[PDB]
Amino acid sequence: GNPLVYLDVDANGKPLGRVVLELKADVVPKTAENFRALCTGEKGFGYKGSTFHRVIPSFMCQAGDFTNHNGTGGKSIYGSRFPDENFTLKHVGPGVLSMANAGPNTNGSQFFICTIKTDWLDGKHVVFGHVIEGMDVVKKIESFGSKSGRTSKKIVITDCGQLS
Ligand SMILES: CCOC(=O)[C@H](CCSC)NC(=O)NCc1ccc(N)cc1
Ligand SMILES: [K+]
Ligand SMILES: [K+]
């Protein structure tokens, strides 16, 4: 079945809880596999210890720049960037998990979790999963953002991995 993965998130070193995500390997196998492997750290790099660097209330929580920590870096398990796999899944509401990018065919490691329906990103960002449990944790993260995206606390993925 589709992988179930988790992120354990803290804010200035205080635990906020766990976000559980389903990855749609049945629809975007290569995108799902990248995220899955970055959660386990099995390639020797990934999300553990990195931050949510850009968090905009009523929009989304963005993370996965584990090289530069500011939205300019990250890398995939395939190399620095990989193509847009397809745009089959849509940004249908809060809890959608989608790939950040800098234009067509620039997927790396950065990703976002939507806190509203972000339909204007349909056909532009590759959707690959959704929140199974811990939308209340996502809302806590959202609470530390701002309209600019700057966070008021350091929001850290303290642990991550695969459940099934
Ligand atoms: C809500 C998601 O927002 C984004 O993805 C914005 C979009 C700027 S318009 C291209 N981009 C960004 O924050 N960051 C740019 C970026 C750079 C390299 C990779 N591998 C991924 C992303
Ligand atoms: K806006
Ligand atoms: K800094």
mmCIF file with all atom_site columns, C-alpha atoms and ligand atoms in Angstrom:
data_model
loop_
_atom_site.group_PDB
_atom_site.id
_atom_site.type_symbol
_atom_site.label_atom_id
_atom_site.label_alt_id
_atom_site.label_comp_id
_atom_site.label_asym_id
_atom_site.label_entity_id
_atom_site.label_seq_id
_atom_site.pdbx_PDB_ins_code
_atom_site.Cartn_x
_atom_site.Cartn_y
_atom_site.Cartn_z
_atom_site.occupancy
_atom_site.B_iso_or_equiv
_atom_site.pdbx_formal_charge
_atom_site.auth_seq_id
_atom_site.auth_comp_id
_atom_site.auth_asym_id
_atom_site.auth_atom_id
_atom_site.pdbx_PDB_model_num
ATOM   1   C CA  . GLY A 1 1   ? 0.000  0.000  0.000   1.00 0.00 ? 1   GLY A CA  1
ATOM   2   C CA  . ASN A 1 2   ? 0.887  3.674  0.006   1.00 0.00 ? 2   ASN A CA  1
ATOM   3   C CA  . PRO A 1 3   ? 3.540  4.656  2.520   1.00 0.00 ? 3   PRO A CA  1
ATOM   4   C CA  . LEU A 1 4   ? 2.495  6.204  5.834   1.00 0.00 ? 4   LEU A CA  1
ATOM   5   C CA  . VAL A 1 5   ? 5.202  8.474  7.200   1.00 0.00 ? 5   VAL A CA  1
ATOM   6   C CA  . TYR A 1 6   ? 5.567  10.842 10.145  1.00 0.00 ? 6   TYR A CA  1
ATOM   7   C CA  . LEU A 1 7   ? 7.150  14.121 11.137  1.00 0.00 ? 7   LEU A CA  1
ATOM   8   C CA  . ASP A 1 8   ? 7.663  14.943 14.862  1.00 0.00 ? 8   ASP A CA  1
ATOM   9   C CA  . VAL A 1 9   ? 7.857  18.709 15.101  1.00 0.00 ? 9   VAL A CA  1
ATOM   10  C CA  . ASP A 1 10  ? 9.032  21.053 17.835  1.00 0.00 ? 10  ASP A CA  1
ATOM   11  C CA  . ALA A 1 11  ? 8.961  24.853 18.329  1.00 0.00 ? 11  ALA A CA  1
ATOM   12  C CA  . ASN A 1 12  ? 12.049 26.272 20.055  1.00 0.00 ? 12  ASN A CA  1
ATOM   13  C CA  . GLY A 1 13  ? 12.744 22.796 21.374  1.00 0.00 ? 13  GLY A CA  1
ATOM   14  C CA  . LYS A 1 14  ? 9.190  22.192 22.723  1.00 0.00 ? 14  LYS A CA  1
ATOM   15  C CA  . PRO A 1 15  ? 7.286  19.255 21.062  1.00 0.00 ? 15  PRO A CA  1
ATOM   16  C CA  . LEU A 1 16  ? 4.189  20.160 19.144  1.00 0.00 ? 16  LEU A CA  1
ATOM   17  C CA  . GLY A 1 17  ? 3.284  16.597 18.212  1.00 0.00 ? 17  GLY A CA  1
ATOM   18  C CA  . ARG A 1 18  ? 3.281  14.287 15.229  1.00 0.00 ? 18  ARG A CA  1
ATOM   19  C CA  . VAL A 1 19  ? 2.102  14.834 11.660  1.00 0.00 ? 19  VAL A CA  1
ATOM   20  C CA  . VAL A 1 20  ? 1.215  11.591 9.839   1.00 0.00 ? 20  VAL A CA  1
ATOM   21  C CA  . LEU A 1 21  ? 1.132  11.667 6.075   1.00 0.00 ? 21  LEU A CA  1
ATOM   22  C CA  . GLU A 1 22  ? -0.049 9.255  3.368   1.00 0.00 ? 22  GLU A CA  1
ATOM   23  C CA  . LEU A 1 23  ? 2.117  9.327  0.271   1.00 0.00 ? 23  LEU A CA  1
ATOM   24  C CA  . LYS A 1 24  ? 0.275  8.620  -3.018  1.00 0.00 ? 24  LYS A CA  1
ATOM   25  C CA  . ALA A 1 25  ? 2.792  6.139  -4.486  1.00 0.00 ? 25  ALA A CA  1
ATOM   26  C CA  . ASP A 1 26  ? -0.118 4.742  -6.505  1.00 0.00 ? 26  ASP A CA  1
ATOM   27  C CA  . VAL A 1 27  ? -0.355 8.030  -8.401  1.00 0.00 ? 27  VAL A CA  1
ATOM   28  C CA  . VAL A 1 28  ? 3.197  9.629  -8.141  1.00 0.00 ? 28  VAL A CA  1
ATOM   29  C CA  . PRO A 1 29  ? 5.557  6.818  -7.300  1.00 0.00 ? 29  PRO A CA  1
ATOM   30  C CA  . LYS A 1 30  ? 8.803  8.692  -7.885  1.00 0.00 ? 30  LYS A CA  1
ATOM   31  C CA  . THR A 1 31  ? 7.701  11.776 -5.884  1.00 0.00 ? 31  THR A CA  1
ATOM   32  C CA  . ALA A 1 32  ? 6.343  9.591  -3.079  1.00 0.00 ? 32  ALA A CA  1
ATOM   33  C CA  . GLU A 1 33  ? 9.505  7.532  -2.955  1.00 0.00 ? 33  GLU A CA  1
ATOM   34  C CA  . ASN A 1 34  ? 11.677 10.663 -2.680  1.00 0.00 ? 34  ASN A CA  1
ATOM   35  C CA  . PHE A 1 35  ? 9.731  11.981 0.280   1.00 0.00 ? 35  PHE A CA  1
ATOM   36  C CA  . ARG A 1 36  ? 9.595  8.560  1.948   1.00 0.00 ? 36  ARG A CA  1
ATOM   37  C CA  . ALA A 1 37  ? 13.331 8.089  1.754   1.00 0.00 ? 37  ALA A CA  1
ATOM   38  C CA  . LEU A 1 38  ? 14.016 11.605 2.998   1.00 0.00 ? 38  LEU A CA  1
ATOM   39  C CA  . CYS A 1 39  ? 11.815 10.787 6.052   1.00 0.00 ? 39  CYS A CA  1
ATOM   40  C CA  . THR A 1 40  ? 13.674 7.553  6.872   1.00 0.00 ? 40  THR A CA  1
ATOM   41  C CA  . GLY A 1 41  ? 17.099 9.114  6.117   1.00 0.00 ? 41  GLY A CA  1
ATOM   42  C CA  . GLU A 1 42  ? 18.063 5.784  4.466   1.00 0.00 ? 42  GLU A CA  1
ATOM   43  C CA  . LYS A 1 43  ? 20.134 7.490  1.724   1.00 0.00 ? 43  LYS A CA  1
ATOM   44  C CA  . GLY A 1 44  ? 22.264 9.251  4.360   1.00 0.00 ? 44  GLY A CA  1
ATOM   45  C CA  . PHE A 1 45  ? 20.503 12.635 4.264   1.00 0.00 ? 45  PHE A CA  1
ATOM   46  C CA  . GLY A 1 46  ? 16.892 13.859 4.727   1.00 0.00 ? 46  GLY A CA  1
ATOM   47  C CA  . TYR A 1 47  ? 14.520 15.852 6.842   1.00 0.00 ? 47  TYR A CA  1
ATOM   48  C CA  . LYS A 1 48  ? 15.518 14.991 10.398  1.00 0.00 ? 48  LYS A CA  1
ATOM   49  C CA  . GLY A 1 49  ? 16.883 18.113 12.130  1.00 0.00 ? 49  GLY A CA  1
ATOM   50  C CA  . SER A 1 50  ? 15.725 20.541 9.427   1.00 0.00 ? 50  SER A CA  1
ATOM   51  C CA  . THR A 1 51  ? 13.088 23.347 9.723   1.00 0.00 ? 51  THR A CA  1
ATOM   52  C CA  . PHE A 1 52  ? 9.762  24.720 8.534   1.00 0.00 ? 52  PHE A CA  1
ATOM   53  C CA  . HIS A 1 53  ? 11.422 27.862 7.112   1.00 0.00 ? 53  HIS A CA  1
ATOM   54  C CA  . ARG A 1 54  ? 8.336  29.578 5.629   1.00 0.00 ? 54  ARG A CA  1
ATOM   55  C CA  . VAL A 1 55  ? 4.924  29.462 7.290   1.00 0.00 ? 55  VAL A CA  1
ATOM   56  C CA  . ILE A 1 56  ? 2.057  31.685 6.029   1.00 0.00 ? 56  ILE A CA  1
ATOM   57  C CA  . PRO A 1 57  ? -1.256 31.619 7.994   1.00 0.00 ? 57  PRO A CA  1
ATOM   58  C CA  . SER A 1 58  ? -4.284 30.838 5.843   1.00 0.00 ? 58  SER A CA  1
ATOM   59  C CA  . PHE A 1 59  ? -2.010 29.429 3.149   1.00 0.00 ? 59  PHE A CA  1
ATOM   60  C CA  . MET A 1 60  ? 0.662  26.807 3.916   1.00 0.00 ? 60  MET A CA  1
ATOM   61  C CA  . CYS A 1 61  ? 3.597  25.532 5.998   1.00 0.00 ? 61  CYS A CA  1
ATOM   62  C CA  . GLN A 1 62  ? 6.769  25.032 3.939   1.00 0.00 ? 62  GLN A CA  1
ATOM   63  C CA  . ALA A 1 63  ? 9.800  22.856 4.859   1.00 0.00 ? 63  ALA A CA  1
ATOM   64  C CA  . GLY A 1 64  ? 12.457 20.470 3.504   1.00 0.00 ? 64  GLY A CA  1
ATOM   65  C CA  . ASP A 1 65  ? 15.365 22.859 2.720   1.00 0.00 ? 65  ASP A CA  1
ATOM   66  C CA  . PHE A 1 66  ? 17.794 20.823 4.714   1.00 0.00 ? 66  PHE A CA  1
ATOM   67  C CA  . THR A 1 67  ? 20.915 22.316 3.032   1.00 0.00 ? 67  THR A CA  1
ATOM   68  C CA  . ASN A 1 68  ? 20.317 26.077 3.240   1.00 0.00 ? 68  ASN A CA  1
ATOM   69  C CA  . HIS A 1 69  ? 17.381 26.306 5.617   1.00 0.00 ? 69  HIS A CA  1
ATOM   70  C CA  . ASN A 1 70  ? 15.847 29.226 3.777   1.00 0.00 ? 70  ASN A CA  1
ATOM   71  C CA  . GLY A 1 71  ? 13.981 28.038 0.700   1.00 0.00 ? 71  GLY A CA  1
ATOM   72  C CA  . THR A 1 72  ? 16.858 28.099 -1.741  1.00 0.00 ? 72  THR A CA  1
ATOM   73  C CA  . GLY A 1 73  ? 18.157 24.561 -1.300  1.00 0.00 ? 73  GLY A CA  1
ATOM   74  C CA  . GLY A 1 74  ? 17.460 20.945 -0.619  1.00 0.00 ? 74  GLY A CA  1
ATOM   75  C CA  . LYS A 1 75  ? 18.036 18.014 -2.903  1.00 0.00 ? 75  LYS A CA  1
ATOM   76  C CA  . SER A 1 76  ? 16.268 14.808 -3.902  1.00 0.00 ? 76  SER A CA  1
ATOM   77  C CA  . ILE A 1 77  ? 17.312 11.205 -3.580  1.00 0.00 ? 77  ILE A CA  1
ATOM   78  C CA  . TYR A 1 78  ? 17.816 11.196 -7.419  1.00 0.00 ? 78  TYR A CA  1
ATOM   79  C CA  . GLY A 1 79  ? 20.095 14.246 -7.633  1.00 0.00 ? 79  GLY A CA  1
ATOM   80  C CA  . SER A 1 80  ? 19.660 17.941 -7.104  1.00 0.00 ? 80  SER A CA  1
ATOM   81  C CA  . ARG A 1 81  ? 16.275 18.232 -8.949  1.00 0.00 ? 81  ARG A CA  1
ATOM   82  C CA  . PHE A 1 82  ? 13.796 15.940 -10.718 1.00 0.00 ? 82  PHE A CA  1
ATOM   83  C CA  . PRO A 1 83  ? 10.957 16.422 -13.165 1.00 0.00 ? 83  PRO A CA  1
ATOM   84  C CA  . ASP A 1 84  ? 7.339  17.084 -12.470 1.00 0.00 ? 84  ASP A CA  1
ATOM   85  C CA  . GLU A 1 85  ? 5.891  13.596 -12.350 1.00 0.00 ? 85  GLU A CA  1
ATOM   86  C CA  . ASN A 1 86  ? 2.281  14.487 -13.185 1.00 0.00 ? 86  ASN A CA  1
ATOM   87  C CA  . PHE A 1 87  ? -0.391 16.880 -11.970 1.00 0.00 ? 87  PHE A CA  1
ATOM   88  C CA  . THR A 1 88  ? -3.104 14.257 -11.412 1.00 0.00 ? 88  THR A CA  1
ATOM   89  C CA  . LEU A 1 89  ? -3.778 15.138 -7.742  1.00 0.00 ? 89  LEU A CA  1
ATOM   90  C CA  . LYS A 1 90  ? -5.178 18.568 -6.953  1.00 0.00 ? 90  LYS A CA  1
ATOM   91  C CA  . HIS A 1 91  ? -4.818 21.044 -4.182  1.00 0.00 ? 91  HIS A CA  1
ATOM   92  C CA  . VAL A 1 92  ? -8.260 20.325 -2.816  1.00 0.00 ? 92  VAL A CA  1
ATOM   93  C CA  . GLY A 1 93  ? -8.096 21.642 0.731   1.00 0.00 ? 93  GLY A CA  1
ATOM   94  C CA  . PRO A 1 94  ? -6.255 21.862 4.007   1.00 0.00 ? 94  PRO A CA  1
ATOM   95  C CA  . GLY A 1 95  ? -3.897 18.930 4.628   1.00 0.00 ? 95  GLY A CA  1
ATOM   96  C CA  . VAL A 1 96  ? -2.672 18.470 1.032   1.00 0.00 ? 96  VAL A CA  1
ATOM   97  C CA  . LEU A 1 97  ? 1.056  17.671 0.766   1.00 0.00 ? 97  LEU A CA  1
ATOM   98  C CA  . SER A 1 98  ? 2.699  19.172 -2.320  1.00 0.00 ? 98  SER A CA  1
ATOM   99  C CA  . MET A 1 99  ? 6.150  19.778 -3.769  1.00 0.00 ? 99  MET A CA  1
ATOM   100 C CA  . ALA A 1 100 ? 7.700  23.276 -3.537  1.00 0.00 ? 100 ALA A CA  1
ATOM   101 C CA  . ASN A 1 101 ? 9.516  24.383 -6.692  1.00 0.00 ? 101 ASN A CA  1
ATOM   102 C CA  . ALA A 1 102 ? 11.169 27.202 -8.557  1.00 0.00 ? 102 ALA A CA  1
ATOM   103 C CA  . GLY A 1 103 ? 9.319  26.615 -11.794 1.00 0.00 ? 103 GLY A CA  1
ATOM   104 C CA  . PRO A 1 104 ? 8.780  23.584 -14.027 1.00 0.00 ? 104 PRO A CA  1
ATOM   105 C CA  . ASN A 1 105 ? 10.882 20.503 -13.313 1.00 0.00 ? 105 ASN A CA  1
ATOM   106 C CA  . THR A 1 106 ? 12.606 21.793 -10.191 1.00 0.00 ? 106 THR A CA  1
ATOM   107 C CA  . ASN A 1 107 ? 11.446 19.374 -7.484  1.00 0.00 ? 107 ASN A CA  1
ATOM   108 C CA  . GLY A 1 108 ? 14.021 18.693 -4.834  1.00 0.00 ? 108 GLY A CA  1
ATOM   109 C CA  . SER A 1 109 ? 13.238 18.109 -1.155  1.00 0.00 ? 109 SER A CA  1
ATOM   110 C CA  . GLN A 1 110 ? 11.189 21.171 -0.255  1.00 0.00 ? 110 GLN A CA  1
ATOM   111 C CA  . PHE A 1 111 ? 7.549  20.573 0.299   1.00 0.00 ? 111 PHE A CA  1
ATOM   112 C CA  . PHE A 1 112 ? 4.492  22.257 1.780   1.00 0.00 ? 112 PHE A CA  1
ATOM   113 C CA  . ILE A 1 113 ? 1.363  21.285 3.743   1.00 0.00 ? 113 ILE A CA  1
ATOM   114 C CA  . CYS A 1 114 ? -1.663 23.366 2.824   1.00 0.00 ? 114 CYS A CA  1
ATOM   115 C CA  . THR A 1 115 ? -3.806 25.035 5.486   1.00 0.00 ? 115 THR A CA  1
ATOM   116 C CA  . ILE A 1 116 ? -6.450 26.140 2.979   1.00 0.00 ? 116 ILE A CA  1
ATOM   117 C CA  . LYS A 1 117 ? -7.497 25.037 -0.467  1.00 0.00 ? 117 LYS A CA  1
ATOM   118 C CA  . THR A 1 118 ? -4.634 26.206 -2.771  1.00 0.00 ? 118 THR A CA  1
ATOM   119 C CA  . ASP A 1 119 ? -6.277 25.468 -6.151  1.00 0.00 ? 119 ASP A CA  1
ATOM   120 C CA  . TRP A 1 120 ? -4.367 28.202 -7.935  1.00 0.00 ? 120 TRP A CA  1
ATOM   121 C CA  . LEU A 1 121 ? -1.307 25.849 -7.671  1.00 0.00 ? 121 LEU A CA  1
ATOM   122 C CA  . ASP A 1 122 ? -3.020 23.085 -9.644  1.00 0.00 ? 122 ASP A CA  1
ATOM   123 C CA  . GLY A 1 123 ? -0.916 22.028 -12.614 1.00 0.00 ? 123 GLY A CA  1
ATOM   124 C CA  . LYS A 1 124 ? 2.060  23.961 -11.158 1.00 0.00 ? 124 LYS A CA  1
ATOM   125 C CA  . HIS A 1 125 ? 3.007  22.013 -8.055  1.00 0.00 ? 125 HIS A CA  1
ATOM   126 C CA  . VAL A 1 126 ? 3.051  18.243 -7.802  1.00 0.00 ? 126 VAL A CA  1
ATOM   127 C CA  . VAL A 1 127 ? 0.619  17.048 -5.114  1.00 0.00 ? 127 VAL A CA  1
ATOM   128 C CA  . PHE A 1 128 ? 1.722  13.746 -3.584  1.00 0.00 ? 128 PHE A CA  1
ATOM   129 C CA  . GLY A 1 129 ? -0.046 13.058 -0.314  1.00 0.00 ? 129 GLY A CA  1
ATOM   130 C CA  . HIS A 1 130 ? -2.128 14.340 2.544   1.00 0.00 ? 130 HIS A CA  1
ATOM   131 C CA  . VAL A 1 131 ? -2.336 14.575 6.256   1.00 0.00 ? 131 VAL A CA  1
ATOM   132 C CA  . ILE A 1 132 ? -3.800 11.479 7.959   1.00 0.00 ? 132 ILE A CA  1
ATOM   133 C CA  . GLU A 1 133 ? -3.426 12.600 11.564  1.00 0.00 ? 133 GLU A CA  1
ATOM   134 C CA  . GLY A 1 134 ? -2.062 15.762 13.165  1.00 0.00 ? 134 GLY A CA  1
ATOM   135 C CA  . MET A 1 135 ? -3.809 18.530 11.339  1.00 0.00 ? 135 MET A CA  1
ATOM   136 C CA  . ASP A 1 136 ? -4.001 20.119 14.863  1.00 0.00 ? 136 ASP A CA  1
ATOM   137 C CA  . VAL A 1 137 ? -0.146 19.939 14.877  1.00 0.00 ? 137 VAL A CA  1
ATOM   138 C CA  . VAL A 1 138 ? -0.078 21.625 11.426  1.00 0.00 ? 138 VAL A CA  1
ATOM   139 C CA  . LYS A 1 139 ? -2.329 24.363 12.874  1.00 0.00 ? 139 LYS A CA  1
ATOM   140 C CA  . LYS A 1 140 ? 0.148  24.864 15.746  1.00 0.00 ? 140 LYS A CA  1
ATOM   141 C CA  . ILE A 1 141 ? 2.982  25.291 13.247  1.00 0.00 ? 141 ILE A CA  1
ATOM   142 C CA  . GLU A 1 142 ? 0.755  27.738 11.273  1.00 0.00 ? 142 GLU A CA  1
ATOM   143 C CA  . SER A 1 143 ? 0.273  29.762 14.514  1.00 0.00 ? 143 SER A CA  1
ATOM   144 C CA  . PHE A 1 144 ? 4.005  30.602 14.558  1.00 0.00 ? 144 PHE A CA  1
ATOM   145 C CA  . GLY A 1 145 ? 4.051  31.960 10.985  1.00 0.00 ? 145 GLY A CA  1
ATOM   146 C CA  . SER A 1 146 ? 3.319  35.379 9.566   1.00 0.00 ? 146 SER A CA  1
ATOM   147 C CA  . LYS A 1 147 ? 2.079  36.913 6.423   1.00 0.00 ? 147 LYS A CA  1
ATOM   148 C CA  . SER A 1 148 ? 5.679  37.353 5.273   1.00 0.00 ? 148 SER A CA  1
ATOM   149 C CA  . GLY A 1 149 ? 6.373  33.682 6.017   1.00 0.00 ? 149 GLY A CA  1
ATOM   150 C CA  . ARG A 1 150 ? 8.781  34.339 8.798   1.00 0.00 ? 150 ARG A CA  1
ATOM   151 C CA  . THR A 1 151 ? 8.383  32.201 11.819  1.00 0.00 ? 151 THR A CA  1
ATOM   152 C CA  . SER A 1 152 ? 8.361  33.603 15.365  1.00 0.00 ? 152 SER A CA  1
ATOM   153 C CA  . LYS A 1 153 ? 9.919  30.429 16.749  1.00 0.00 ? 153 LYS A CA  1
ATOM   154 C CA  . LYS A 1 154 ? 12.346 27.901 15.340  1.00 0.00 ? 154 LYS A CA  1
ATOM   155 C CA  . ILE A 1 155 ? 10.131 25.080 13.964  1.00 0.00 ? 155 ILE A CA  1
ATOM   156 C CA  . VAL A 1 156 ? 12.182 21.855 13.695  1.00 0.00 ? 156 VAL A CA  1
ATOM   157 C CA  . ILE A 1 157 ? 11.444 18.389 12.419  1.00 0.00 ? 157 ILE A CA  1
ATOM   158 C CA  . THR A 1 158 ? 13.018 16.597 15.328  1.00 0.00 ? 158 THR A CA  1
ATOM   159 C CA  . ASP A 1 159 ? 12.322 13.138 14.074  1.00 0.00 ? 159 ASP A CA  1
ATOM   160 C CA  . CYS A 1 160 ? 10.772 11.477 11.048  1.00 0.00 ? 160 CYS A CA  1
ATOM   161 C CA  . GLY A 1 161 ? 10.322 8.043  9.507   1.00 0.00 ? 161 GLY A CA  1
ATOM   162 C CA  . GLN A 1 162 ? 7.969  5.499  8.106   1.00 0.00 ? 162 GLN A CA  1
ATOM   163 C CA  . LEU A 1 163 ? 5.098  3.748  9.944   1.00 0.00 ? 163 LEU A CA  1
ATOM   164 C CA  . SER A 1 164 ? 3.978  1.327  7.184   1.00 0.00 ? 164 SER A CA  1
HETATM 165 C C1  . LIG B 2 .   ? 3.733  27.245 -1.761  1.00 0.00 ? 1   LIG B C1  1
HETATM 166 C C2  . LIG B 2 .   ? 4.991  26.682 -2.381  1.00 0.00 ? 1   LIG B C2  1
HETATM 167 O O1  . LIG B 2 .   ? 5.865  27.777 -2.680  1.00 0.00 ? 1   LIG B O1  1
HETATM 168 C C3  . LIG B 2 .   ? 6.997  27.586 -3.458  1.00 0.00 ? 1   LIG B C3  1
HETATM 169 O O2  . LIG B 2 .   ? 7.228  26.459 -3.795  1.00 0.00 ? 1   LIG B O2  1
HETATM 170 C C4  . LIG B 2 .   ? 7.815  28.799 -3.863  1.00 0.00 ? 1   LIG B C4  1
HETATM 171 C C5  . LIG B 2 .   ? 7.177  29.219 -5.192  1.00 0.00 ? 1   LIG B C5  1
HETATM 172 C C6  . LIG B 2 .   ? 7.757  30.461 -5.913  1.00 0.00 ? 1   LIG B C6  1
HETATM 173 S S1  . LIG B 2 .   ? 6.973  30.598 -7.580  1.00 0.00 ? 1   LIG B S1  1
HETATM 174 C C7  . LIG B 2 .   ? 8.025  29.492 -8.547  1.00 0.00 ? 1   LIG B C7  1
HETATM 175 N N1  . LIG B 2 .   ? 9.209  28.470 -3.967  1.00 0.00 ? 1   LIG B N1  1
HETATM 176 C C8  . LIG B 2 .   ? 10.032 28.425 -2.932  1.00 0.00 ? 1   LIG B C8  1
HETATM 177 O O3  . LIG B 2 .   ? 9.658  28.723 -1.823  1.00 0.00 ? 1   LIG B O3  1
HETATM 178 N N2  . LIG B 2 .   ? 11.314 28.144 -3.012  1.00 0.00 ? 1   LIG B N2  1
HETATM 179 C C9  . LIG B 2 .   ? 12.029 27.884 -4.190  1.00 0.00 ? 1   LIG B C9  1
HETATM 180 C C10 . LIG B 2 .   ? 12.501 26.433 -4.317  1.00 0.00 ? 1   LIG B C10 1
HETATM 181 C C11 . LIG B 2 .   ? 13.834 26.199 -4.684  1.00 0.00 ? 1   LIG B C11 1
HETATM 182 C C12 . LIG B 2 .   ? 14.346 24.915 -4.957  1.00 0.00 ? 1   LIG B C12 1
HETATM 183 C C13 . LIG B 2 .   ? 13.458 23.807 -4.799  1.00 0.00 ? 1   LIG B C13 1
HETATM 184 N N3  . LIG B 2 .   ? 14.015 22.499 -5.068  1.00 0.00 ? 1   LIG B N3  1
HETATM 185 C C14 . LIG B 2 .   ? 12.165 24.058 -4.384  1.00 0.00 ? 1   LIG B C14 1
HETATM 186 C C15 . LIG B 2 .   ? 11.667 25.342 -4.180  1.00 0.00 ? 1   LIG B C15 1
HETATM 187 K K   . K   B 3 .   ? -2.294 36.188 -0.380  1.00 0.00 ? 2   K   B K   1
HETATM 188 K K   . K   B 3 .   ? 19.714 31.578 10.936  1.00 0.00 ? 3   K   B K   1
#
